[PDB]
Design a binder for this molecule. Structure first.
Ligand SMILES: [Mg+2]
Ligand SMILES: [Mg+2]
Ligand SMILES: [Mg+2]
Ligand SMILES: [Mg+2]
Lengths: 204, 196, 212, 125, 195, 223, 226, 222, 195, 196
């Protein structure tokens, strides 16, 4: 009945020294029934990464919408959109549906190509921006993620250390949520290389 | 209902309108809302007519049995018996009662028992739907130790205004005077009090 | 929750998952869903955790009183009926139970009774109860034979819970196995579903849909 | 009433000329000179304040206008046409950009929006 | 309606759909075909609210047939499934939404691969080796999780499908009056007339 | 289950170095009607305890009668009724807390919030709260209803933790309480200007102050 | 949320806490609740966070255009009128509760605004879940003719009351001072009385702790030449 | 309509060691957005080397603890001062809770102590009396924030030995009382940061063969 | 439970009752016997709410068996049906009524006549040549109204019953997993093991 | 709210308390409920603060545009504009407004517009939650053609009683005097009016 917990899933993002990380589980379900273990929730438009949790139809719709908008942006601006600018575009787009909203929890992650500064941000379903310096969480196990991140996180972690921290934050949070799991992906993002790693986890 | 009781130099006087209502229909325009529970302990009734009649009949029974064993009860005692019934049966009752009586030791006393079943001893009390419209008037015009004639005028003028503004109140103004001299009934008709 | 019990040549296999949830929140992965009523009788836990725990250890007390008074092991029929008659007294009050009372006596042989909080009492060969019951039934129905060995029957029960644990969001944690003989039940260990899934995937060749 | 002019007032002549655009350019030619120069660390725009009367306070007439905090504009031709274009340019910088991206538009894209408005007055009814 | 199943094997996609139509108290028909051919190598099965199912399916069919004529070209299964998803995603925020769940089985002639897409009435799309809608998956997925291989033949897929239907006929309370089975491969769409 | 009819608003209190202070206004409201203007809501029990009550007034009068009966009962066959076997604040509270929880458990509550303030035999300050649900708690400052939201923040600036209690004199504590009562009069629509205040000190005993008024008010800035 | 506004001698000050919540969970520990409508008109918002943020930017945008159109610096009464009419039209469905303060050629101003469209004037105001705690402090220590230093002190003390006593409020105090004939000074994290203590243990993992199935390079670059 | 229940917030945590057990809880008591008390003890020594906490609705919580303490007293009277073992206490609490099955104590109960072999023991109860012996259990408001952290740092879940890449698990080595207290403090410090109902103070009761010891630590008061 | 049928022919009463037991989503059993022998020549079938059905049936069985022992005599079918009716009529104004409908088939040894009684959970009793409970009658009564004769043999009654079950299996949405059929005549009660 | 307007010999005076309420919390204790829609046409507001502010702003706009075209509007005209908004939007509004103004031709006039959107011209009017308690007092004490000082006393005493009994009313008493001489604002503090 509650649209934000029909399909399930989680996303988490973290900052490190000259890098950012964003991660998600792979489950899509119909309440108790597991339907897919390959439903990735992280997308990218140029060097800007977007994770989306919540109602899966809206997750797909919004990805298609932001691909649409960032493609037109690039053609007109003659440059790739930056994380700070894209964050405002997500906020604007969500608020235009104020009284008929997309039931989602978006998360932006990326590095500004000119300043080199790591950037992350979160939103509620209606557009309010949460611009944390440390970490952003979203999904049906957001409480669990807040608990993991608050204790595991420390500032200025090197890329390969940040990978371990965010991976352990996701995995252990997902294992305490019925509607999350069935696989996981972690993106490690540096100024001009991005590595994608699929994690081994319990399949119940 | 517009009802009130007022202590004065020689004792206490109870006052009431005579309207009984079921909806907008006046089911009785000459009702007697001033009820005797003992020789010189009377009460004014507001709320459910069934409830306040049932309570008053039980209190009269209690005070009759009290008198046979222990002699004349105090007004405080009568108020306590009313309170016990109203408090313990608060879930099932809709009753707002003012108790007024004359002792020789205590003289005139007034107790008000609102919906919840609490007791409040006061120099004077007002109750019923019509009382809302005369809180200002009564507070400005009440004095302690008034004469009989002044107290009759105060109640007549007060209930006149309550009747004027409250559709649920009307008819005649009945009064009962409680002093050492005895019990006196008064009645005032519309042609008298409307021109005040 | 997923719980099952089935009759076969070598007695009864009882298999259950270990997960308890409050909404989407996973409260526990280490819940004991097989109640050891006594050394000869087992009960399964589904519906209300307290209702099942409380009334099935109570049942153990009634069974103990019976054998003290009658100098004879209580039948599965009599034991199951004591529980069903008790919950029928409470019908309407809001008890929640779905349980299999399992035993193996001389006069009856291996016997399973499904007992329900609305008063139902059914004797049967295969029962499966919980949010993941439909998944476990599929594996059971297509592989069940009376002439299964104790080893193969134990695996079938383990594999059926694994099937439910995989698909049903509210089932998982670990698998508890029991084998009920005439001389009493025998515990066959706790098996973590996380480790069991990968082991079964490789050895069996199943779950090709999942990357490992 | 109703605007019953739903047809174009600018059309191609046999020679391929769009007369009304050419005539608009002639009006610009009569206008007071304005210029712009780009440096390595800045840009300058300038024009003459041709005061219509010495009793007029020419400081109250702004020929050089701020469009955004980092963009300015100057003109040659019809002053009133410029004034309304500045109003439209200021608004479109907000409605079609700042209210979407949370930042002011780059020069080339604001220019693009002003150009679009001027193109439509060349084809609309 | 009720049960719709799908399985993608080595070289084909197989869709199985129940034959019963029930209007509350009575079974009005036991031979209903809950499917529409969208293009020569693309088939769509459907289930949901009465009326809306056929109305939606025929609407989609008309649109794909229109595209085929306009371009003289058959859209890929992926492209068709995306079009269908968008229509349902549009529908869910309408005045009165289409209450229709679909499976799309197609053979991509360019990639020479079978493809199965599952889309619910919200516009939730997933590509799967096997899929279902309603309660069908609750009974059948444990069997498919066990026996499924990506290199299965069409005959092996039909046998695994028979095992799924047998389990449905055993444990489901409703009589769905059997299934119509259709195969989608490089040669097009055909119906298995004995099942 | 019932609904409160005639009601009393905030009761506020705090500990200080040698004892406790408690206060409550003299109003009995009938919804938005400010009906009864002479209601005493602080009820002393002996010379070592003051019970402050908010909520339903009919239930308050019932509790008042229970406490009166408690004193009578304690004196029965008790030669040390005015000495070692006198009623302690802790005895009076535990009794009330028992009654409140029992009444909520029969789905027929006494619709009140109660603060028991006093000094024990050994000189220790006693301050504890109980309400219609039977919920109990203790703190250096305690307040009911609106007082909880507006008085506590002010009183906690004086005594923020346990170690602040010995550093707080009776003059500073009373000053803080009186200021809080003024703030409540400014901001609570069901409050009155007239209030009562009680001090229970381990040296000077029980001081009960009636007919106090909120003074030194500011409106002038009505701008 | 706790927000306050206080008038003083030659201007006005607003302040706010920095906690934003989602039910009982703290979403952001250092949230920015002080918004800019124009250079010298600032407002603080309580209620639905997206609504306060959105209604502030819309009116702020229209205020900027109005300022350019009229060649005059924006007035607080304009921001107030535009905010209240917008909020009234939406009948409370836009859940924005604001304290609006600023300086303009007319002088210094302080107003509050409620989601249904009602406005209030005052020398001192508070809004949000911690408004009762804050108003208690304001009613205890406010006087006429406060200095700049006294007003900043009073405002932050009122926010602290909310921080410590209201569960909906916490973390830090933000302040903005708007004085006549001066630039508005935004003091982000003016007070920081809630730094977390060092943890007992480091939770940095050994490298290789997490099990990995597959690794791959993600192509973020555009299609390449040659 | 009268609602007989309320929510007083609070978070509790029980951990069983090899020869010890700890039961910890924050000292903050609340209703809605207000603080009732910054120090209201929630974990209690019940005698016989047993510690108990009943978190949730504080009136029901106080009532249950009071009745269990009473049950310990009468166990001594009826059974010749025999020590009530932790397993026997657990079964007894089930009956106290299930006695009100149709008008429940709205609490999540945890007890801690040592079993009859001297090993650490923790038992956990639902509102109507279902119970389990457990190694690790958080209860109340911030339970969902704490448990995943404990799964990872006590049981070493999802942690494998470097170099093996998922093939060999990190071995489950026993933790000292000093090590457990570190994890308890970090659990509550993190919970305080992200949950509004958690704060003010942390009180820990430690149970060994020598008896019951107490430790108190300040938490953030916002 | 679901379908229970009854038919009284020349010399016997035949009761047919479905075998399925459904717990919401799944069919837990397909061999359930929804009947109890009250006395050697009296049989009662039943359907209604779970638990209450068997509890009521066994309670009645115990009472009739008690009477049989006390008096060393078998009560007539009419007498048994009146006892059962009174129990249900008492039950309907209880705190929690028995939600149970029954058919009572008996052979009266005194009158040498078969008898069929239909009683619903309210205590509504009627003697009939053929009867049913629930929706069963809606499908079967038009066939029974046509073919029924009072002088039918037991074999002809079974054939007419087969036609009724076939119509149920065609038009009913639920799968009731066939029926157990039992015959009551002068020699007692027996089960037809192939149907 | 306790609000009132009273005509007298030299014109009309409006009076009001200063309390704004969200539940039992006083959201503003120094509110100005006397609102100017034209130079010598003011109004008293009761009901939803959002609604009555929105209405008053629209009326002020209408009368400003009226004045630019047709000169000074009458008090009757102002009342009509208020009525039009209140009547036509009765489903979506909760507003009770008293309109008071001074012409030189018509002198002091008072119009009351209750919830439904009807108009009633009266010698004086009372409204708001607190008005219920002073119907009796005002009816007994109002006279036509009072002096300025008498009218100030009548309003001060009336609103004093309304404040005393109504929890929703309180703070300072404000008044606005409308005569040929101009517009005069008055304010009276608690220490003054509570001792009356
Ligand atoms: Mg999971
Ligand atoms: Mg699972
Ligand atoms: Mg906290
Ligand atoms: Mg007042």
């Amino acid at each position: 009945s509650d649209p934000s917990s029909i399909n399930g899933g989680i996303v988490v993002a973290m900052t490190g020294k000259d890098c950012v990380a964003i991660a998600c589980d792979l489950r899509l379900g119909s309440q108790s029934l597991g339907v897919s273990n390959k439903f990735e929730k992280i997308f990218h438009y140029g060097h800007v990464f977007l994770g989306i949790t919540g109602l899966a139809t809206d997750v797909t719709t919004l990805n298609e919408m932001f691909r649409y908008k960032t493609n037109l942006y690039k053609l007109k601006e003659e440059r790739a959109i930056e994380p700070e600018t894209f964050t405002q575009l997500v906020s604007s787009s969500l608020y235009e549906r104020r009284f008929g909203p997309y039931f989602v929890g978006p998360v932006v992650a990326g590095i500004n190509s000119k300043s080199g500064k790591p950037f992350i941000a979160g939103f509620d379903l209606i557009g309010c921006i949460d611009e944390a310096k440390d970490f952003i969480v979203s999904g049906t196990a957001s409480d669990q993620l807040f608990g993991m991140c608050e204790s595991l996180y420390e500032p200025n972690l090197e890329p390969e250390d940040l990978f371990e921290t965010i991976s352990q934050a996701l995995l252990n949070a997902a294992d305490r949520d019925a509607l999350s799991g069935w696989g996981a992906v972690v993106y490690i993002i540096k100024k001009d290389e991005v590595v994608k790693r699929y994690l081994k986890m319990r399949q119940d | 209902t517009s009802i009130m009781a007022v202590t004065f130099k020689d004792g206490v006087i109870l006052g009431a309108d005579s309207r009984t209502t079921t909806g907008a229909y006046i089911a009785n325009r000459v009702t007697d809302k001033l009820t005797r529970v003992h020789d010189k302990i009377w009460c004014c009734r507001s709320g459910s007519a069934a409830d306040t009649q049932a309570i008053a009949d039980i209190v009269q029974y209690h005070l009759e049995l009290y008198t046979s064993q222990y002699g004349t009860p105090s007004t405080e005692t009568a108020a306590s018996v009313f309170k016990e019934l109203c408090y313990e049966n608060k879930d099932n009752l809709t009753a707002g009662i003012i108790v007024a009586g004359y002792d020789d030791k205590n003289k005139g006393e007034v107790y008000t028992i609102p919906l919840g079943g609490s007791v409040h001893k006061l120099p004077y009390a007002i109750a019923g739907s019509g009382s809302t419209f005369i809180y200002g008037y009564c507070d400005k015009n009440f004095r302690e130790n008034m004469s009989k004639e002044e107290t009759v005028d105060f109640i007549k003028h007060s209930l006149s205004q309550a009747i004027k503004w409250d559709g649920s109140s009307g008819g005649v103004i009945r009064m009962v005077v409680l002093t050492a001299a005895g019990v006196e009934r008064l009645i005032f008709y519309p042609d008298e009090y409307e021109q005040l | 929750t997923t719980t099952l019990a089935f009759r076969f040549q070598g007695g009864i296999i009882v298999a259950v998952d270990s997960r308890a949830t409050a909404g989407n929140w996973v409260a526990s992965q280490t819940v004991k869903k097989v109640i050891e009523i006594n050394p000869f009788l087992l009960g399964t836990m589904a519906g209300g955790a307290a209702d099942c725990q409380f009334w099935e250890t109570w049942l153990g007390s009634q069974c103990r009183l019976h054998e003290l008074r009658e100098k004879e092991r209580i039948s599965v029929a009599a034991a199951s009926k004591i529980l069903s008659n008790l919950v029928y007294q409470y019908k309407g009050a809001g008890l929640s139970m779905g349980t299999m009372i399992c035993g193996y006596t001389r006069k009856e042989g291996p016997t399973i009774y499904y007992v329900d909080s609305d008063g139902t009492r059914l004797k049967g060969d295969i029962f499966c109860v919980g949010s993941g019951q439909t998944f476990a039934y599929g594996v059971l129905d297509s592989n069940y034979k009376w002439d299964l060995s104790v080893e193969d029957a134990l695996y079938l029960g383990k594999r059926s819970i694994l099937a439910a644990a995989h698909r049903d969001a509210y089932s998982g944690g670990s698998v508890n196995l029991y084998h009920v003989t005439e001389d009493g039940w025998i515990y066959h260990g706790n098996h973590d579903v996380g480790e069991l899934f990968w082991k079964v995937k490789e050895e069996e060749g199943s779950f090709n849909n999942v990357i490992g | 009433m109703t605007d019953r002019y739903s047809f174009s007032l600018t059309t191609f002549s046999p020679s391929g000329k769009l007369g009304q655009i050419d005539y608009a350019l002639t009006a610009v030619k009569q206008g007071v000179t304005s210029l712009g120069i780009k440096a390595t660390n800045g840009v300058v725009i300038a024009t003459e304040k041709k005061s219509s009367s010495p009793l007029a306070m020419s400081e109250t007439l702004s020929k050089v206008s701020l469009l955004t905090p980092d963009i300015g504009a100057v003109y040659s031709g019809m002053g009133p046409d410029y004034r309304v274009l500045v109003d439209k340019s200021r608004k479109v910088a907000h409605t079609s950009y700042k209210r979407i991206y949370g930042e002011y538009p780059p020069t080339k894209l604001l220019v693009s929006e002003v150009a679009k408005i001027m193109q439509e007055a060349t084809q609309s009814g | 309606m009720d049960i719709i199943l799908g399985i993608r094997v080595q070289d084909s996609v197989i869709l199985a759909s129940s034959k019963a139509v029930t209007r509350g108290i009575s079974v009005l028909k036991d031979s209903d075909d809950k499917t529409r051919q969208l293009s020569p190598h693309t088939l769509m099965s459907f289930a949901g609210e009465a009326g809306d199912t056929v109305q939606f399916a025929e609407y989609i069919q008309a649109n794909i047939q229109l595209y085929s004529i306009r371009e003289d070209y058959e859209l890929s299964p992926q492209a068709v499934s995306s079009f269908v998803r968008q229509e349902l995603a549009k529908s869910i925020r309408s005045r009165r939404p289409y209450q229709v769940n679909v499976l799309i089985g197609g053979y991509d002639k360019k990639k020479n691969k079978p493809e199965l897409y599952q889309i619910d009435y919200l516009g939730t799309k997933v590509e799967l080796p096997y899929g279902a809608h309603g309660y069908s998956g609750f009974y059948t997925f444990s069997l498919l999780d066990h026996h499924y291989r990506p290199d299965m033949t069409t005959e092996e897929g039909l046998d695994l499908l028979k095992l799924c239907v047998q389990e449905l006929e055993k444990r489901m309370p409703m009589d769905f009056k059997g299934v119509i089975v259709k195969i989608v491969d490089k040669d097009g769409i055909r119906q298995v007339d004995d099942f | 289950t019932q609904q409160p009819i005639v009601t009393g608003t905030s009761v506020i209190s705090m500990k200080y170095d040698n004892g406790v202070i408690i206060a409550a206004d003299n109003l009995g409201s009938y919804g938005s009607l400010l009906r009864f203007n002479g209601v005493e809501r602080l009820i002393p029990v002996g010379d070592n305890t003051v019970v402050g009550i908010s909520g339903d007034i009919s239930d308050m009068q019932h509790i008042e009668r229970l406490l009166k009966d408690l004193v009578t009962e304690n004196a029965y066959d008790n030669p040390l009724a005015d000495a070692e076997e006198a009623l302690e604040p802790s005895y009076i509270f535990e009794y009330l807390a028992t009654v409140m929880y029992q009444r909520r458990s029969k789905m027929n509550p006494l619709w009140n919030a109660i603060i028991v303030a006093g000094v024990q035999s050994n000189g220790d300050q006693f301050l504890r709260y109980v309400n219609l649900l039977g919920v109990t708690y203790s703190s250096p400052t305690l307040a009911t209803g609106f007082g909880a939201h507006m008085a506590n923040p002010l009183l906690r600036k004086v005594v923020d933790r346990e170690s602040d209690i010995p550093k707080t004199t009776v003059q500073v504590a009373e000053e803080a309480i009186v200021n809080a009562m003024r703030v409540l009069y400014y901001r609570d629509a069901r409050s009155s200007r007239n209030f009562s205040l009680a001090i229970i000190d381990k040296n000077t005993g029980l001081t009960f102050k009636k007919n106090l008024q909120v003074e030194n008010m500011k409106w002038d800035f009505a701008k | 949320t706790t927000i306050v506004g206080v008038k003083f001698n030659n201007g006005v000050v607003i302040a706010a806490d920095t906690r934003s919540t989602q039910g009982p969970i703290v979403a952001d520990k250092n949230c920015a609740k002080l918004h800019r409508i124009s250079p010298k008109i600032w407002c603080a918002g309580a209620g639905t966070a997206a609504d306060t943020e959105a209604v502030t930017q819309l009116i702020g945008s229209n205020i900027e255009l109005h300022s350019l159109y009229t060649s005059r610096e924006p007035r607080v009464v304009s921001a107030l009128q535009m905010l209240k009419q917008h909020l009234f039209k939406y009948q409370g469905h836009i859940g924005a509760y604001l304290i609006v303060a600023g300086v303009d050629p007319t002088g210094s101003h302080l107003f509050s605004i409620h989601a249904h469209g009602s406005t209030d004037v005052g020398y001192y105001l508070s809004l949000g879940s911690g408004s009762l705690a804050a108003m208690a402090v304001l009613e205890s220590h406010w006087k006429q003719d406060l200095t700049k230093e006294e007003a900043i002190k009073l405002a932050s003390d009122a926010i602290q009351a909310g921080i410590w006593n209201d569960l909906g409020s916490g973390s830090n105090v933000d302040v903005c001072v708007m004085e006549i004939g001066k630039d508005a000074e935004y003091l982000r994290n003016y007070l920081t009385p809630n730094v977390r203590e060092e943890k007992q243990k480091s939770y940095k993992f050994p490298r290789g702790t997490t099990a990995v199935l597959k690794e791959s390079i993600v192509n973020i670059c555009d299609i390449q030449e040659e | 309509q009268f609602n007989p229940y309320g929510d007083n917030g609070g978070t509790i945590l029980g951990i069983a060691g090899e020869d010890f057990a700890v039961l910890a809880g924050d000292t903050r008591n609340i209703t809605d957005y207000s603080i009732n008390s910054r120090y209201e003890p929630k974990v209690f020594d019940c005698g016989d080397n047993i510690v108990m906490s009943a978190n949730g609705f504080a009136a029901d919580g106080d009532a249950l603890v009071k009745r269990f303490k009473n049950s310990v007293k009468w166990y001594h009277f009826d059974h010749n001062d025999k020590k009530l073992s932790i397993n026997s206490a657990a079964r007894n609490i089930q009956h106290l809770l299930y006695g009100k099955r149709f008008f429940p104590y709205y609490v999540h109960t945890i007890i801690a102590g040592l079993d009859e072999d001297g090993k650490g023991a923790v038992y956990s109860f639902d509102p109507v009396g279902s119970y389990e012996r457990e190694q690790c259990r958080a209860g109340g408001a911030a339970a969902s924030l704490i448990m995943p952290f404990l799964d990872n740092q006590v049981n070493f879940k999802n942690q494998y030995e470097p170099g093996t890449n998922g093939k060999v698990k990190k071995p489950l080595k026993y933790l000292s009382v000093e090590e457990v207290i570190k994890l308890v403090r970090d659990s509550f410090t993190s919970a305080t940061e992200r949950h509004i109902q958690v704060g003010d103070g942390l009180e820990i009761l430690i149970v060994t063969k020598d008896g019951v010891r107490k430790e108190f630590y300040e938490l953030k008061r916002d």
